[PDB]
Amino acid sequence: GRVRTKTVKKSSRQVIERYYSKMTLDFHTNKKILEEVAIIPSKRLRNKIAGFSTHLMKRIQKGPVRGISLKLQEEERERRMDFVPDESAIQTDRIEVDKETIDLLASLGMSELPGVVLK
Amino acid sequence: KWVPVTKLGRLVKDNKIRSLEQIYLHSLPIKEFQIIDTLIGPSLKDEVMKIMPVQKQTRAGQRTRFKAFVVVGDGNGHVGLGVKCSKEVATAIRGAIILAKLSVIPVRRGYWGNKIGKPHTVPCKVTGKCGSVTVRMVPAPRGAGIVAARVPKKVLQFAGIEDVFTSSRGSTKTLGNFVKATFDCLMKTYGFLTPDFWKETRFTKSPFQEYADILSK
Amino acid sequence: GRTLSTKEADIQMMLAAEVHLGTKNCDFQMERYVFKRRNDGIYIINLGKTWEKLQMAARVIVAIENPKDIIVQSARPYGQRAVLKFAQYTGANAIAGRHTPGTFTNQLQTSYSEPRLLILTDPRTDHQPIKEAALGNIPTIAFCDTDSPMRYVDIGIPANNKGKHSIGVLFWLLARMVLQMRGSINQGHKWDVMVDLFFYRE
Amino acid sequence: MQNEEGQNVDLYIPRKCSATNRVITSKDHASVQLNVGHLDDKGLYIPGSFTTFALCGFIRAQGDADSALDRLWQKKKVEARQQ
Amino acid sequence: VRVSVLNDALKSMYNAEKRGKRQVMIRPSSKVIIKFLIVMQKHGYIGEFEYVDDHRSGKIVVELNGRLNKCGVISPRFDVGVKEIEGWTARLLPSRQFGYIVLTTSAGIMDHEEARRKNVGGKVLGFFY
Numbered sequence A: 001g002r003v004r005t006k007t008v009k010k011s012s013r014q015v016i017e018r019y020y021s022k023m024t025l026d027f028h029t030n031k032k033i034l035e036e037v038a039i040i041p042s043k044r045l046r047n048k049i050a051g052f053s054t055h056l057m058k059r060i061q062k063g064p065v066r067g068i069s070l071k072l073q074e075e076e077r078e079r080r081m082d083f084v085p086d087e088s089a090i091q092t093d094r095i096e097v098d099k100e101t102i103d104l105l106a107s108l109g110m111s112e113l114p115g116v117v118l119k
Numbered sequence B: 001k002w003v004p005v006t007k008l009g010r011l012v013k014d015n016k017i018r019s020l021e022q023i024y025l026h027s028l029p030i031k032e033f034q035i036i037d038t039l040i041g042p043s044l045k046d047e048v049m050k051i052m053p054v055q056k057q058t059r060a061g062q063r064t065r066f067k068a069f070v071v072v073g074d075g076n077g078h079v080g081l082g083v084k085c086s087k088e089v090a091t092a093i094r095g096a097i098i099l100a101k102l103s104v105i106p107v108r109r110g111y112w113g114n115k116i117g118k119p120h121t122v123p124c125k126v127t128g129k130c131g132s133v134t135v136r137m138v139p140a141p142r143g144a145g146i147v148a149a150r151v152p153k154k155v156l157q158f159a160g161i162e163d164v165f166t167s168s169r170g171s172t173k174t175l176g177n178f179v180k181a182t183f184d185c186l187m188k189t190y191g192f193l194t195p196d197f198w199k200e201t202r203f204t205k206s207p208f209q210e211y212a213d214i215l216s217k
Numbered sequence C: 001g002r003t004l005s006t007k008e009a010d011i012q013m014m015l016a017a018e019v020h021l022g023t024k025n026c027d028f029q030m031e032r033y034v035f036k037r038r039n040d041g042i043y044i045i046n047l048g049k050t051w052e053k054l055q056m057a058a059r060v061i062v063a064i065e066n067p068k069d070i071i072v073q074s075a076r077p078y079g080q081r082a083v084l085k086f087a088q089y090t091g092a093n094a095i096a097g098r099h100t101p102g103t104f105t106n107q108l109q110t111s112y113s114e115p116r117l118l119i120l121t122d123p124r125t126d127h128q129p130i131k132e133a134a135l136g137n138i139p140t141i142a143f144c145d146t147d148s149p150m151r152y153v154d155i156g157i158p159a160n161n162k163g164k165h166s167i168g169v170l171f172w173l174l175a176r177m178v179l180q181m182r183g184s185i186n187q188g189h190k191w192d193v194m195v196d197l198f199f200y201r202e
Numbered sequence D: 001m002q003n004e005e006g007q008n009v010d011l012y013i014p015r016k017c018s019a020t021n022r023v024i025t026s027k028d029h030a031s032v033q034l035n036v037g038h039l040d041d042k043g044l045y046i047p048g049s050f051t052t053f054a055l056c057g058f059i060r061a062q063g064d065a066d067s068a069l070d071r072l073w074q075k076k077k078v079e080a081r082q083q
Numbered sequence E: 001v002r003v004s005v006l007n008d009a010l011k012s013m014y015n016a017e018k019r020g021k022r023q024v025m026i027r028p029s030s031k032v033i034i035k036f037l038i039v040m041q042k043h044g045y046i047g048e049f050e051y052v053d054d055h056r057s058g059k060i061v062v063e064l065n066g067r068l069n070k071c072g073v074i075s076p077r078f079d080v081g082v083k084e085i086e087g088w089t090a091r092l093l094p095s096r097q098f099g100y101i102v103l104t105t106s107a108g109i110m111d112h113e114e115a116r117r118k119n120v121g122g123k124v125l126g127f128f129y
């Protein structure tokens, strides 16, 4: 079989994390980049790492990849996730409460709360 | 040298905490033996009580490892017990010394009858149990000495108790269980609620709260 | 007119978020907070006790000199955003997702922590952090539903800790109460922070 | 514990559980100490002022710590005018 | 069947105090039980207790201080002279500084220290500390 060992996976993950800006989806350019930005004792190991890095980049283009923390992806997610709607998704104008909640509020003395109506 | 990895260790290295009683009051875990070495290290003494071999059966024979039992104490109300298993006797003894230091506890000493001078015996009747071994300590009058077997006698001597009556039941030839039952009996000294403790507790700031600003960096 | 008091508006918001809807089972130690059982079988939580417990938890939290000694974590996906926002605004630390065993006991672990207070969204799903905190003299605060286990829970806040809206509203209210007690924001039910920042979003 | 002269003799005075009155031992790592801050007339925390409660491991392992602490805080707040 | 109502009362109080309860129930009531409770309360080991009338043996509700380590009955009620009190205390009490043995003497139900003071013997009822 062809299962990349821990060394190849770790090297590809770290290289993508540190140099995502220059990465491409072409194996040959990726291997040249690895030659430039990393020291790999063996040519075969360099080729394997380049191939797995290309695979990881192809996966990343689709969406998030677990174990790889890219600054731009996290920043974009935070920007999208810090937004709020124009109107809050909590309607206090009309509240449908069963009778039991009505006795609850009456015991609390809160029997006149606006927007509280029995089903 | 020593780089503390815990808030308690940082405080002890910074001289914010100066007595083991401060840690005992709040029941904070002690995870570095350098804390004990700094606080009560000079007065502490150690002693190897037993080297016990244990064997695990394997496909190619028996793998032997050695169990080290170490007792530490200052003879003035502090005692600790340490058990460590390792391939080498020296490594086991070092680990047992570290563990014994890490487990030092305060021992409460009281009076049999009249309360003149320093305490000489256990404040009350206490019992410890490990496995099938049960150790009972009974207060004794001044001059009675330590009436105990050699293992409990050594443990009591390291705790600073002057005279006590003891009784044991079960397989006391299991040295580990014997020493552990003695240690449990000694620990139970401070858990017994006596009338002299009926006063309302007046709480004080914990070290992590008192020195929160210092630990904030 | 007749402007509502802070408690009135808070309970109205809780009702809007369905904070008072429990499960079909009640823990014997959560019964004191349950008002009554409805014909269906769902237990109705007393929102006044929930508000009082929220105030009590805020009182406990405000007394911590360094907010960084407080750790709030949620195991479930719904409460992760709520705990993140709570840590962001109150100034504490947040742990969203799986909790690494030994985080509170393994002093040599990289993630080792010594919090002065622990806040949990659900005792049932956060059982491991509670058990670990039981080994390190760490007080615990948790949002407890009718069926939540109360073991090693110091301050339980009776509330529905399963719905996204309920969890978000609870954490938003707790953050507002803590900030108001600190004095960094104005008193009352109004807070500039939009409550839906705490809601789980697809 | 004191001597006949009147000198304190104990190494230290251990704390006691606020609910069960049990002695909290040195190795009781399930015990906790909590401070409940006080509020002024404007609902602002007064630094340095709080009510301290201690719970032993026994009560917390039983799950009764929550109700006991609630009752103790209610009584202490009634006494201390914290409302 | 029920043989010692005092034993049941003391065992209930002991179990409740161990559990941490603030109150315990004693049924049936008895004047021996009431005297034992009064001796205990005199020394601060219990709070206020209330007797409930039901036109029967009765009931008692006892407040628990949390100071009670253990209360127990001794059966059979052995004869204790003024000279055997020391041995009985050595057998039963944790220390010579605190703890009490309750006796029933011709002068009434009292703790062992008062029995020594009045030089009166009797029968042992129980102990507490």
Ligand SMILES: [Mg+2]
Pocket: none
């Ligand atoms: Mg009869």
